[PDB]
Ligand binder design. Structure first.
Ligand SMILES: Nc1ncnc2c1ncn2[C@@H]1O[C@H](COP(=O)(O)OP(=O)(O)OP(=O)(O)O)[C@@H](O)[C@H]1O
Ligand SMILES: Nc1ncnc2c1ncn2[C@@H]1O[C@H](COP(=O)(O)OP(=O)(O)OP(=O)(O)O)[C@@H](O)[C@H]1O
Ligand SMILES: [Mg+2]
Ligand SMILES: [Mg+2]
Lengths: 11, 51, 396, 407, 832, 239
C-alpha cells in the first residue's frame, strides 16, 4: 500500500 | 541492513542496493586490508543472513 | 580487439611451511624482479622529433574532447563540444580520415575548433576501474570440495578458452553465463576469485550496485559500456556479484527511481542475448537469492548453467577445514571430526570463523598451538546469529 | 578472565618458536610487493596514441593554413524568415544551446540558398549565416539500423509456424505483395507487439524477419532512447522515425519496449516523466513504415500503446506444443554430432511446458555431457541426462517420495 | 598484571635471581638448581609463553663474571644453561650461542623444540660467520650439528634438518641419519632446492641428494639425479651396482631417453638388449606400435592442415608445402606426397627448394635406418645432383636421435663430405651432425676436423661445419672438438666474419660447452684474441651456451645488461643476449615464468634488434607448451610492422604449439594466414607455424626436458639453439638460401605417450588417472601429485606439464617417475 | 498460490497440499522395513531420548493386530490416531469375517483411512508414511509402505523418514537372496541398514522382529547390543 519512492536526476 | 524483501511495489529496494554494497565491500571479490566494522544494533534477528 | 589484458600474477611460492625452499623461491622472484627493475630504470638512463613537433604546435595545449557527429566533406566534420553544442570544425591533414567515425571522441583544437586527433580508449573511469589488474590470490586448490560445481564453472569460463576444439568439434556453443546461487557463505565469490587467478582472459568485475547511476541514462549506458569493453578486450568474463541488486522481478512501479533500475536490467537483459548476438564475453553472476531474480535474466540462454552451492556436506566440510587449517599449527590432539560431524548447518564461511576464533582462543591461554578444546569453545563462540530455530518434538 | 596480552607477553609470542627464516622470508615477501609497486609506476603510463595519420598523407604547410584562414562555424537552425523587405531577410537562427538570434547572411551565401528550417552554419562573432548544412543525420540513430543482415533464417524458428505466418502477414506480406491487402481493402496492421514467456522465440522471430527483409531494418536499442538531458529521448524517437519515412520499406524493431513504454503515472518530481514524455512522443509518432515490438512482460505496457490503433496486431508466442518442440529440437541439433537414431520425439515429451530456449540448452548441455566424458558422439543417454539437468533440475520439486502418487 | 600463580612466580624467580648477589655456599647450587627446574618445566611445555623467560628479565653480568670465579667447574656451567635459555628469547645471539658452546652440555632435547631450533639457527649463523681462518670454533659447532640434526629427523622437521645442513655448507650426515620413512621427504627436498641453489653448492647438493638415494637402494631415482649433474661416472657405477637386471633394463631406458650412451662391457648380461635399448633401436617398434593403438597411422596432407575451404605454385610456398609434409607427417613412416611423386614435387623447387624437400624425406621417416634408408632410394642421385645435400640431411636426419651399430651416417656421408660442390657438402656435414648429435665419437669428430681446415669449403659449408661438430660434442666440452673449434675459430679472418653465416661459427663453440659454466672461463679467455665485433658476439653466445639451464641469475643479470644497452657490430651481441636469458632461465618454472615479464619489457622498451630476438626467446621458454599468456604475447606481435618480428613471432607460435595440436593456436594460425596472404615471406612461415603446431600429429614434443621436466636433454638443447640463433637473422638464413636449417630441431624430437604394457611388454591397459602435475614437496603424507584427473586407458598422451600415475595398485613401477617407457612390475603386495 | 487448499489442482495437475504433506514424513526418524523368509524386521532410529523422560511413552512401532506390526514416520499426533483406527479396524473386520486381517487389507484400509481425509477441504491429511509389515498373510511375509497421499505400496525392503534416500540407496545394493537366507542374517541387514543413523550412535537403533505364527518381539537392549556388537564384529572384517 503506502509506497516510498526513490528518484533520479535529469541533468 | 534489515532482511532483504522481495522486490515489488512496496519493499525496500534502495536501502537494499546499498546493503548489497556493504555486503560485498567487507568480504567481496576484492579483499579488504585493515578495515574493521563495529555495527551496533538492538534487534539481531532482523538483519539479513549475509550480514 | 586489443587482446586479453589478463591480470598480472607473480608466480606462486610453495612450500608454505616457511622452509628454506620458500625463501629461495621468493628470492628468485625477487632476483628477476630486481633485474627487471634494473632494465626499466637502466633503459631510461642508458637511453640518452622534427616531424611530430610541428604537429604538436598546430594542436597546442590543451585539446578538447567532443563527439563527432557528421563528416560533411573530406576536410570538414561537425563536432559537438563537451557541453552539447555543435561546431562545423575543419579536419586537418594529420588526423586520420579513417579512424574518424560518427560517435568517436575527437580531439579538438582549443582556439579554433578543428579536428586534431581521435581519442580511442575513452572508456569511462567508472568502467575502467571495473577491470581486474592484480589477479586475486586464491587458486582452485584453495577451494575445497565443489568439484561438481567447479567443473560446471570450468566448462563455461576456462575450458572454452583452452580446448575450443572439443566444443566446435561437437556442435555445442560453449555455455556462456552462469548464475552462482546458494546460501550465504558457501563459496560463491571464492570460486569467482579462483577463476580470475587461473583465467587468461580479461576479468572485469562489478558488484551489482556499481552499475546503477543516478542520472536517467547514466545507468543503462554504463552497462552498454561494460559489455563494450569486455567485447573489446577479446576473451573476457564479467562477474556481476550480488546481481540481486539490479535484476529483481520487474513490476509496475509507481516510482520513477525504480523504473530506471529496471531500465538497466532491461539493458543487461539485451546486452546478453538480443538482436546482434554477442561475441566472446562470458558472464558470471552470483546471488544468494535466486528466487527473486527476474525469470528472464536467468532464462536459459543468458545464464546457461545455474550452479547451485549447497551448504557444505560432511566430506566437503572436512576438506574445507584443512584448506583453512593448512597454515595453522594443530596439536596432535586436534581431531577435527568432533566438530565436522555435527548436524549444525556450518557454512563454509562459518568454518573459517571457527578457525580464526580457535586460533585467537589460543592467544588467550598463551599458546600458538591450538588444542582440541580451542575448537570446541570456538564452535560455540562462532556459531551465533543462527541460534536454534526448529519445530518442537511434534514429529517422531 | 580474558587477560590482555601484556607487552612482555607479546615479545615472546613473536620470537619464541619462530622458524629462523621467518624474519628473512617475511622480509623477502615484503620486498617483492614494494618492488612490484615501483615496477608498475615506472611503466604504468602506456602511451595512448591519438589517431594521427601516416606521415605521407600530411600537408603540414597547408594544415597551418586551414587553422588560420578557415574559422569554426556554430551549427544552427533557421526557425523563421522575417524577410524584412524581401531584400534584407533578417533570418532568425537557433544556436541550439547558446540563444535565439536574428542574424543576417554573410555575403558568401545566397539569399535563396537558406530555406526556412534547414540547418544553417553561423560565425562565432556576429552569427551571420556563412554556409548551408546537410539535414541532421543522427550519429546514434544512423548506427541503429542493422547494416549486417542477421544470419538466422526462417528455418531456424521452429514450432511457431502460425505465429510466424501471422507476423509475415503484417511485416513481410503487406510489403512485398500490396495487392492482396488492397483487393479486399483491408488496412495492413502497421505493427505487431510480440509477447510471450521469456525465451519462447520473440527475438529469434525478430532476427529471422531481418534476414528476409528487403527493407531497412532499424533495431531500436531501448537504452539510447532514455538520455540524461531532458527531451533528448523524444528527439531520438523523431530522428529514428524521420529516418524511416525517408527510406522506402523501413521496419523499426523496438526490442524490450518495457524500457521506454512503462505505464504512465504522475511522477513529475523526478526524471521519470522524462522517459514518459519520450513515449508520448512515440505514441504520437506511431499514431511505408512497419513497426515491431517485443515484450516478455506485456502487462507493464501502457494501455494506450497496446490499443488496436497503434499495435493493430498482438502475436502471442506460447510455449511450444509437442509437434513443435520436436521441431525446435531438430533445428538446434542439425549441427550437433548426435548419434543417428535419437528419439527427439521422446525428448519432447520429457520437456513439458518448456520454452524454445530451454530446449536449446538441453542440446548444449547434451554435448557438455559428451565432452566431460570423452565421447565424440552425443548419444541419447546423454540427452536424458541433459533433460534432467536443464529442464527437470530446475522445473519443480515433484520428487519420488511425493511422486509415488502418480502411476 | 599477574595472579597468585603469576605474581608468586615473579617473586620466586625474583628471589632466586636476587639470592645470587653474594657468594654464599647455599646460594649457587640451590638457586641455579631451581632456575633449572622452573625454566625447564615451562620451556619443555606447550608453546605457552615461557613464564620463566617473561618473569626473568635479569642481567647476567653478575653471574657471567662470577661464573669464572664461582666454581669454574659444575657450578660455573649451570649458570650458563640458565642464561643461555634466557638468551634465545632476547637478542644476544653471539652470547646466546656461545653459552651452550661453553656452558653445561647436558643434551639439547632437554630444553625444548623451540630452543633446539633457535640453537640451530645460531649454529648455522655462527658457522657461516666462521670462515676457513680457524676450525677450532668449527669442531664445537660441528659437534652441535651432530646431535641437533637427529633431533629434527624424528620430529617431522626434515625441512629444518635439510635446511640446517645446507646452511653449514656441509650435508654429508643426512646419509647416516635418514630413515626408510624419510628418504622421500629429504630426497624430494634437495631435488627441489638444487635448481635454485647457486654454484658450486647446487652441484654438491645433487650428488649428496643422489647419495641419499643410494643408501636405501632406490636405484632409478639415483639415475635422474646422476644425469642432472651430467656426470657419467656415477651413472656407470649405478649401471654397475644394479645387480638386478630389470632395474638395469629400466635405467637404460632412462639413459636412452636422455640420449646418453655408455659403452657397455660384454660382462653385463643382455648387452645387446641393453645396447639395443640404449642404441634406441626398440623405439621405432613402439612408435609404430603406439600409432596402431592410437589409430593415427594414416598420413596427412598439407591441404587438410591449412583448411583452404574456410579461408575467405611458387617455389617458396612449395617449400612450406614441403616442410609441412615433413614435421606434420614426420616419424609416421609414410607420406602421401614425398614418397610417390617426389621427383615431380621437388622439380618445382629451385635449388634450395630441392634441398629442403629432399631433407624432409628423411625426417618423414625418422628412427628407421632401414625403412627410411629404403625410403631414401629415389632422389639424392638427382639430375640436379644439387639435391644430394637434401637427401644427405635426410641421410643424417634419419640417424639423428638413434645409434646403429653399423654406423650408417659416417659411411654414406663421408664419401661426399669431401665432395667439391658446395651444396653437396652442406647436406653432408649438417646431416652428419644430426645423426651423431651428442655422440662425441672421435672418428666422426676427427673426420669433421678437416672440414674446418678445408679452405676450399665455402663459408656456408663452414658455418654448418662448426655447427655440425658442435652438435656432436654437445655438453661434453670435448678437448679435441673444442680445440678444433677453438683452433678453427681463432683462424677466422675479419672480412669473412662480417657475413651472416659466420654467425654460426661461435654457435659451435658453445654447443660444445652446454651445461658447464666452470670450464667456460677459459674458453672465453681464448676467444679474446679475435677482434670485434665477433669477439664480443662469440663471447656472449659462448657465454650463453655455458649456462644452458643453470638458473644463474648472475649470468642473466649479466645477459640482461647486454640487451639493456642502446647502441651494428655491437647488434648481433644483443640479439644473442635476449636469447641468452631464455636459455639460462628455462630450467625452473619460477624463474622461467618471470623471464616472460622481462621479455615483455624488452619489447615495449626495446629496439629493432632486440624486438626481433624476443619472439624467438619466448620460443625456447615454452617449447611444445601452449601457455595461453605466451601464445597471446606472440600474436599481438604476430602482425608487427617489421618483417623480422612478424616472422619470428610466427615461428615462436609454431614452437610453442609444437605437437600440442592446440586448436586455438591453429585457429590463431589460420587467421594470420588470411591476414598475411599477400606477403610470401610471412605466408611461408605462418604456414610453417601451422606445420610445427602439428609435429607428428602432435605425437612428438621438442621440449628439452624429461623426467617431470627435471632431467635436461643435452642433445636437444643443441638443436633448438641452432635454429633459434640461426633465426636471429631470418632473412639471410631463413628467408635466404638456408631453408634446411629448420631440420636442426630433429635432434630434440621425442615422443610423448602413455602406452602401458604388461610385464611381458604386451600393452597392459591400466586405468591411469592423469592430470596436471602438482608438486609433493613440503606436503606431509601421501600428497596427490595429479590434479584435474581424467582417467585414460593407456596408451595415453601427456601434453607438456602433465604426469601419469598408475591408478591401479596392482603394479609397482620400477622407476618412480612415469615418463616414457616404464617397466610395470606386478605388485606382490596386491591381493585380489 | 495453488498451495493453500487441498482440492485445488495446480496448472500442471498437481495436488500440492499432498506433496507438502509428504514433507512431514521426510522429517521423522528413519524407519526401515525389510521382509525376510521367516522374520519381517522393521527398525526405528533416532530414538533420541531426553535424558529425563521415560521412553515407554515414545513407542513408535506398534502392532496393529496380533500378526501385523506398524512402524510409522511423520508427525506423532496423527500417528497415534491412525494406529487407533487401524487397531479398531483389524478387530472389527475379524468380527465381520471370522478370518483375521491380512497385511495387505489393513494397508488398504489405512490407505483408505488417509485418502478420505485428503479428498475434501476442511480436513488435514495424516502426515505419516507408515511401514506396514506383518506375516498374517498366512505363509508369505509381506511389508507395505503407506503414504499420506493415500497410495499403499509393496516393497521387499523400504526406508521412510529423515534419510530414506541414504538408507534406500544403501539397501538396494546390499539386499539379496543370500542376505535374507538366514534369520539372524536378516536382522543383521537392518541393523547394518539403520547403522547409517544420523550420528551412527549404535545405541539408538531399535529393531522389532515378528516371525511366522509367532508374536512380536521388541528386541531388548541386550540382544540388540549383541546384534549391534555382532554386526560390528562381522564388519570388523574390513581390516
Ligand atoms: N568450499 C569452500 N572451500 C574453502 N573455502 C571456502 C569454501 N566456501 C567458502 N569458503 C571461504 O569463504 C570465504 C568467504 O566466502 P565467499 O566469499 O566464498 O562467500 P560468497 O559466496 O561471496 O558469499 P555471499 O553470499 O555473502 O556474497 C573465503 O575466504 C573462503 O575461504
Ligand atoms: N521458439 C524458439 N525456437 C528456436 N530458438 C529459440 C526459441 N526460443 C528461444 N530460442 C533461442 O533463444 C534465442 C533468443 O531467445 P528469444 O529470442 O526468445 O529471446 P527473448 O524472447 O527476446 O527473451 P526476452 O523477451 O526475455 O528478451 C533464439 O535466438 C534461439 O537461439
Ligand atoms: Mg559474494
Ligand atoms: Mg528481444
Amino acid at each position: 500500500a503506502x509506497x516510498x519512492x526513490x528518484x533520479x536526476x535529469x541533468x | 541492513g534489515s532482511s532483504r524483501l522481495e522486490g515489488g511495489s512496496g519493499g525496500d529496494s534502495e536501502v537494499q542496493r546499498t546493503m548489497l554494497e556493504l555486503l560485498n565491500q567487507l568480504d567481496g571479490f576484492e579483499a579488504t586490508k585493515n578495515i574493521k566494522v563495529i555495527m551496533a544494533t538492538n534487534r539481531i534477528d532482523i538483519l539479513d543472513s549475509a550480514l | 580487439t586489443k587482446g586479453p589484458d589478463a591480470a598480472s600474477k607473480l608466480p606462486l611460492v610453495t612450500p608454505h611451511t616457511q622452509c628454506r625452499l620458500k625463501l629461495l623461491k621468493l628470492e628468485r622472484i625477487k632476483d628477476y624482479l630486481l633485474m627487471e627493475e634494473e632494465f626499466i630504470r637502466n633503459q631510461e638512463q642508458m637511453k640518452p622529433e622534427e616531424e611530430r613537433s610541428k604537429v604538436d604546435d598546430l594542436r597546442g595545449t590543451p585539446m578538447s574532447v567532443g563527439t563527432l557527429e557528421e563528416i560533411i566533406d573530406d576536410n570538414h566534420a561537425i563536432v559537438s563540444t563537451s557541453v552539447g553544442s555543435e561546431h562545423y570544425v575543419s579536419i586537418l591533414s594529420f588526423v586520420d580520415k579513417d579512424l574518424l567515425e560518427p560517435g568517436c571522441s575527437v580531439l579538438l583544437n582549443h582556439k579554433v575548433h578543428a579536428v586534431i586527433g581521435v581519442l580511442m580508449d575513452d572508456t569511462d573511469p567508472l568502467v575502467t576501474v571495473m577491470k581486474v589488474e592484480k589477479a586475486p590470490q586464491e587458486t582452485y586448490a584453495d577451494i575445497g570440495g565443489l568439484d561438481n560445481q567447479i567443473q560446471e564453472i570450468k566448462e563455461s569460463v576456462e575450458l572454452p578458452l583452452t580446448h575450443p576444439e572439443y566444443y566446435e568439434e561437437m556442435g555445442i556453443k560453449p555455455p556462456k553465463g552462469v548464475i552462482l546461487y546458494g546460501p550465504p557463505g558457501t563459496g560463491k565469490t571464492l570460486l569467482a576469485k579462483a577463476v580470475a587467478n587461473q583465467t587468461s582472459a580479461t576479468f572485469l568485475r562489478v558488484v551489482g550496485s556499481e552499475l546503477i547511476q543516478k542520472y536517467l541514462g547514466d545507468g543503462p549506458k554504463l552497462v552498454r559500456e561494460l559489455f563494450r569493453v569486455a567485447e573489446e578486450h577479446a576473451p573476457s568474463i564479467v562477474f556481476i556479484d550480488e546481481i540481486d541488486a539490479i535484476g529483481t522481478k520487474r513490476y509496475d512501479s509507481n516510482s520513477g527511481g525504480e523504473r530506471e533500475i529496471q531500465r538497466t536490467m532491461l539493458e543487461l537483459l539485451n546486452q546478453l542475448d538480443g538482436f546482434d548476438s554477442r561475441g566472446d564475453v562470458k558472464v558470471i553472476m552470483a546471488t544468494n537469492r535466486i528466487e527473486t531474480l527476474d525469470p528472464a535474466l536467468i532464462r536459459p540462454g543468458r545464464i546457461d548453467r545455474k550452479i547451485e552451492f549447497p551448504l557444505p556436506d560432511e566430506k566437503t566440510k572436512k576438506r574445507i577445514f584443512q584448506i583453512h587449517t593448512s597454515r595453522m599449527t594443530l596439536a596432535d590432539d586436534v581431531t577435527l571430526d568432533d566438530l565436522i560431524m555435527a548436524k549444525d548447518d556450518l557454512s563454509g564461511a562459518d568454518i573459517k570463523a571457527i578457525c580464526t576464533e580457535a586460533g585467537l582462543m589460543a592467544l588467550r591461554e598463551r599458546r600458538m598451538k591450538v588444542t582440541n578444546e580451542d575448537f570446541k569453545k570456538s564452535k560455540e563462540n562462532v556459531l551465533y546469529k543462527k541460534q536454534e530455530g526448529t519445530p518442537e518434538g511434534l514429529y517422531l | 578472565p580474558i587477560r590482555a596480552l601484556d607487552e612482555g607477553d607479546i615479545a615472546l609470542l613473536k620470537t619464541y618458536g619462530q622458524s629462523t627464516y621467518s624474519r628473512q622470508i617475511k622480509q623477502v615477501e615484503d620486498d617483492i610487493q614494494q618492488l612490484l609497486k615501483k615496477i608498475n609506476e615506472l611503466t604504468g603510463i602506456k602511451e595512448s596514441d591519438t589517431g594521427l595519420a601516416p606521415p605521407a598523407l600530411w600537408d603540414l604547410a597547408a594544415d597551418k593554413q586551414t587553422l588560420q584562414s578557415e574559422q569554426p562555424l556554430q551549427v544552427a537552425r533557421c526557425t523563421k524568415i522575417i524577410n524584412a523587405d524581401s531584400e534584407d531577410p533578417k533570418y532568425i537562427i537557433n544556436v541550439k544551446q547558446f540563444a535565439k538570434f536574428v542574424v543576417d547572411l554573410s555575403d558568401q551565401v545566397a539569399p535563396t540558398d537558406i530555406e526556412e528550417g534547414m540547418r544553417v552554419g553561423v560565425d562565432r562573432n556576429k552569427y551571420q549565416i556563412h554556409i548551408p548544412l546537410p539535414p541532421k543525420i543522427d550519429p546514434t540513430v544512423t548506427m541503429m539500423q542493422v547494416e549486417e543482415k542477421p544470419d538466422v533464417t526462417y528455418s531456424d524458428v521452429g514450432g511457431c509456424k502460425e505465429q510466424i505466418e501471422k507476423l509475415r502477414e503484417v511485416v513481410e506480406t503487406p510489403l512485398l505483395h500490396p495487392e492482396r491487402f488492397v483487393n479486399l481493402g483491408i488496412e495492413p496492421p502497421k505493427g505487431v507487439l510480440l509477447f510471450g514467456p521469456p525465451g519462447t522465440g520473440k527475438t529469434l522471430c525478430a532476427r529471422a524477419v531481418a534476414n528476409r527483409t528487403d527493407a531497412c531494418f532499424i533495431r531500436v536499442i531501448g537504452s539510447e532512447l532514455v538520455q540524461k538531458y531532458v527531451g533528448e529521448g523524444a528527439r531520438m524517437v523523431r530522428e529514428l522515425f524521420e529516418m524511416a519515412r525517408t527510406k522506402k520499406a523501413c521496419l523499426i524493431f523496438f526490442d524490450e519496449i518495457d524500457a521506454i513504454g512503462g505505464a504512465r503515472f504522475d511522477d513529475g518530481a523526478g526524471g521519470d516523466n522524462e522517459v514518459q514524455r519520450t513515449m508520448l512522443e512515440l505514441i504520437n509518432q506511431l499514431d511505408n513504415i512497419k513497426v515491431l515490438m517485443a515484450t516478455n512482460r506485456p502487462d507493464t505496457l501502457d494501455p494506450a500503446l497496446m490499443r488496436p490503433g497503434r499495435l493493430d496486431r498482438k502475436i502471442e508466442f506460447s510455449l511450444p506444443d509437442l509437434e513443435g518442440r520436436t521441431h525446435i529440437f531438430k533445428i538446434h541439433a542439425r549441427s550437433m554430432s548426435v548419434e543417428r537414431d535419437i528419439r527427439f520425439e521422446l525428448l519432447a515429451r520429457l520437456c513439458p511446458n518448456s520454452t524454445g530456449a530451454e530446449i536449446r540448452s538441453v542440446c548444449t548441455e547434451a554435448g557438455m555431457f559428451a565432452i566431460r566424458a570423452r565421447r565424440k558422439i552425443a548419444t541419447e543417454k546423454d540427452f536424458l541426462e541433459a533433460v534432467n539437468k536443464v529442464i527437470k533440475s530446475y522445473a519443480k520439486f515433484s520428487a519420488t517420495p511425493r511422486y509415488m502418487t502418480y502411476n | 598484571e599477574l595472579s597468585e600463580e603469576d605474581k608468586q612466580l615473579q617473586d620466586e624467580l625474583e628471589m632466586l635471581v636476587e639470592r645470587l648477589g653474594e657468594k654464599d655456599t647455599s646460594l649457587y647450587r640451590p638457586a641455579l638448581e631451581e632456575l633449572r627446574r622452573q625454566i625447564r618445566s615451562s620451556t619443555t611445555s606447550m608453546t605457552s609463553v615461557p613464564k620463566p623467560l617473561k618473569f626473568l628479565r635479569p642481567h647476567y653480568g653478575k653471574l657471567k663474571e662470577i661464573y669464572e670465579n664461582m666454581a669454574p667447574g659444575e657450578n660455573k656451567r649451570f649458570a650458563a644453561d640458565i642464561i643461555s635459555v634466557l638468551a634465545m628469547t632476547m637478542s644476544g645471539e653471539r652470547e646466546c650461542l656461545k653459552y651452550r658452546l661453553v656452558g653445561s652440555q647436558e643434551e639439547l632435547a632437554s630444553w625444548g623444540h623451540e630452543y633446539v631450533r633457535h640453537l640451530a639457527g645460531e649454529v648455522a649463523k655462527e658457522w657461516q660467520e666462521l670462515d676457513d681462518a680457524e676450525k677450532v670454533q668449527r669442531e664445537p659447532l660441528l659437534t652441535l650439528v651432530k646431535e641437533i640434526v637427529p633431533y629434527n629427523m624424528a620430529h617431522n622437521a626434515e625441512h629444518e634438518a635439510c635446511d640446517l645442513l645446507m646452511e653449514i655448507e656441509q650435508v654429508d650426515m643426512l646419509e647416516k641419519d635418514i630413515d626408510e620413512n624419510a628418504y622421500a621427504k629429504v630426497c624430494l627436498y634437495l631435488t627441489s632446492c638444487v635448481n635454485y641453489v647457486p654454484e658450486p653448492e647446487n652441484s654438491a647438493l645433487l650428488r649428496c641428494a643422489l647419495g641419499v638415494f643410494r643408501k636405501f637402494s632406490r636405484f632409478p631415482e639415483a639415475l635422474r639425479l646422476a644425469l642432472m649433474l651430467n656426470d657419467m661416472e656415477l651413472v656407470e657405477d649405478i649401471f654397475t651396482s644394479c645387480k638386478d637386471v630389470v632395474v638395469q633394463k629400466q635405467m637404460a631406458f632412462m639413459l636412452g631417453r636422455h640420449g646418453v650412451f655408455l659403452e657397455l662391457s660384454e660382462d653385463v648380461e643382455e648387452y645387446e638388449d641393453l645396447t639395443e635399448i640404449m642404441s634406441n633401436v626398440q623405439l621405432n617398434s613402439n612408435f609404430l606400435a603406439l600409432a596402431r593403438e592410437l589409430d593415427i597411422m594414416e598420413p596427412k596432407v598439407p591441404d587438410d592442415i591449412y583448411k583452404t575451404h574456410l579461408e575467405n605454385d611458387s617455389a617458396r610456398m612449395n617449400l612450406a608445402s614441403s616442410f609441412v609434409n615433413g614435421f606434420v607427417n614426420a616419424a609416421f613412416g609414410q607420406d602421401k606426397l614425398l614418397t610417390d611423386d617426389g621427383n615431380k614435387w621437388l622439380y618445382k623447387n629451385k635449388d634450395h627448394g630441392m634441398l629442403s624437400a629432399a631433407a624432409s624425406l628423411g625426417m618423414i621417416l625418422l628412427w628407421d635406418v632401414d625403412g627410411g634408408l629404403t625410403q631414401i632410394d629415389k632422389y639424392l642421385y638427382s639430375s640436379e645432383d644439387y639435391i644430394k645435400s637434401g637427401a644427405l640431411l635426410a641421410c643424417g636426419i634419419v640417424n639423428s636421435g638413434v645409434r646403429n651399430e653399423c654406423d650408417p651416417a659416417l659411411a654414406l656421408l663421408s664419401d661426399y663430405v669431401l665432395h667439391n660442390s658446395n651444396t653437396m657438402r652442406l647436406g653432408s656435414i649438417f646431416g652428419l651432425g644430426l645423426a651423431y648429435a651428442g655422440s662425441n665419437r672421435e672418428d666422426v669428430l676427427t673426420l669433421l676436423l678437416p672440414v674446418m681446415g678445408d679452405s676450399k669449403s665455402s663459408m656456408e659449408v663452414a658455418g654448418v661445419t662448426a655447427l655440425a661438430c658442435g652438435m656432436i660434442a654437445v655438453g661434453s666440452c670435448n678437448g679435441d672438438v673444442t680445440s678444433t673449434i677453438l683452433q678453427t675459430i681463432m683462424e677466422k679472418s675479419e672480412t669473412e666474419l662480417k657475413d651472416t653465416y659466420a654467425r654460426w661459427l661461435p654457435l659451435g663453440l658453445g654447443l660444445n660447452h652446454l651445461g658447464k659454466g666452470e670450464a667456460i672461463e677459459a674458453i672465453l679467455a681464448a676467444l679474446e684474441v679475435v677482434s670485434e665485433p665477433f669477439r664480443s658476439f662469440a663471447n656472449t653466445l659462448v657465454d650463453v651456451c655455458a649456462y644452458a639451464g643453470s638458473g644463474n641469475v648472475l649470468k642473466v643479470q649479466q645477459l640482461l645488461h647486454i640487451c639493456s644497452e642502446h647502441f651494428a657490430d655491437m647488434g648481433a651481441h644483443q640479439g644473442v643476449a635476449v636469447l641468452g636469458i631464455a636459455l639460462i632461465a628455462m630450467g625452473e618454472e619460477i624463474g622461467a615464468e618471470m623471464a616472460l615479464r622481462t621479455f615483455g619489457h624488452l619489447l615495449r622498451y626495446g629496439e629493432p634488434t632486440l624486438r626481433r630476438a624476443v619472439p624467438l626467446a619466448l620460443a625456447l621458454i615454452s617449447v611444445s607448451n601452449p601457455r595461453l599468456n605466451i601464445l597471446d604475447t606472440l600474436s599481438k606481435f604476430s602482425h608487427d610492422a617489421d618483417p623480422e618480428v612478424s616472422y619470428n613471432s610466427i615461428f615462436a607460435m609454431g614452437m610453442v604449439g609444437s605437437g600440442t595440436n592446440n586448436a586455438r593456436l591453429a585457429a590463431m594460425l589460420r587467421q594470420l594466414a588470411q591476414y598475411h596472404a599477400k606477403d610470401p615471406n610471412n605466408l611461408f612461415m605462418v604456414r610453417l607455424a601451422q606445420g610445427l603446431t602439428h609435429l607428428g600429429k602432435g605425437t612428438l614434443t621438442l621440449c628439452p626436458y624429461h623426467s617431470d621436466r627435471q632431467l635436461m636433454s643435452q642433445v636437444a638443447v643443441a638443436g633448438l639453439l641452432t635454429v633459434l640463433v640461426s633465426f636471429l637473422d631470418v632473412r639471410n638464413i631463413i628467408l635466404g638460401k638456408s631453408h634446411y636449417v629448420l631440420y636442426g630441431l630433429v635432434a630434440a624430437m621425442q615422443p610423448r605417450m602413455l602406452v602401458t604394457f604388461d610385464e611381458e611388454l604386451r600393452p597392459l591397459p591400466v586405468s591411469v588417472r592423469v592430470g596436471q602435475a602438482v608438486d609433493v614437496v613440503g606436503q606431509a603424507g601421501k600428497p596427490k601429485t595429479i590434479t584435474g584427473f581424467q582417467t585414460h586407458t593407456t596408451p595415453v598422451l601427456l601434453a607438456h606439464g602433465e604426469r601419469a600415475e598408475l591408478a591401479t595398485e596392482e603394479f609397482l613401477p620400477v622407476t618412480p617417475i612415469l615418463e616414457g617407457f616404464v617397466i610395470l612390475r606386478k605388485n606382490p603386495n596386491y591381493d585380489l | 498460490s495453488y498451495d493453500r487448499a487441498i482440492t485445488v489442482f495446480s496448472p500442471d495437475g498437481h495436488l500440492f497440499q499432498v506433496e507438502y504433506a509428504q514433507e512431514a514424513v521426510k522429517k521423522g526418524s528413519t524407519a526401515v522395513g525389510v521382509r525376510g523368509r521367516d522374520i519381517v524386521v522393521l527398525g526405528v532410529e533416532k530414538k533420541s531420548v531426553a535424558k529425563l523422560q521415560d521412553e515407554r511413552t515414545v513407542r513408535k512401532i506398534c502392532a496393529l493386530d496380533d500378526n501385523v506390526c506398524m512402524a510409522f514416520a511423520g508427525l506423532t499426533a496423527d500417528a497415534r490416531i491412525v494406529i487407533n483406527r487401524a487397531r479398531v479396524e483389524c478387530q472389527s473386520h475379524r468380527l465381520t469375517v471370522e478370518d483375521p486381517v491380512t497385511v495387505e487389507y489393513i494397508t488398504r484400509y489405512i490407505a483408505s483411512l488417509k485418502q478420505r481425509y485428503t479428498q475434501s477441504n476442511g480436513r488435514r491429511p495424516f502426515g505419516i508414511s507408515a511401514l506396514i509389515v506383518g506375516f498374517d498373510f498366512d505363509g508369505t511375509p509381506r511389508l507395505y509402505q503407506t503414504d499420506p497421499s493415500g497410495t499403499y505400496h509393496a516393497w521387499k525392503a523400504n526406508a521412510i523418514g529423515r534419510g530414506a534416500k541414504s538408507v534406500r540407496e544403501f539397501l538396494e545394493k546390499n539386499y539379496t537372496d543370500e542376505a535374507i537366507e538366514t534369520d539372524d542374517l536378516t536382522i543383521k541387514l537392518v541393523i547394518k541398514a539403520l547403522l547409517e543413523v544420523v550420528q551412527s550412535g549404535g545405541k539408538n537403533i531399535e529393531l522389532a522382529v515378528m516371525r511366522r505364527d509367532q508374536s512380536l518381539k521388541i528386541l531388548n537392549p541386550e540382544e540388540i547390543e549383541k546384534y549391534v556388537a555382532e554386526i560390528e564384529k562381522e564388519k570388523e572384517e574390513n581390516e
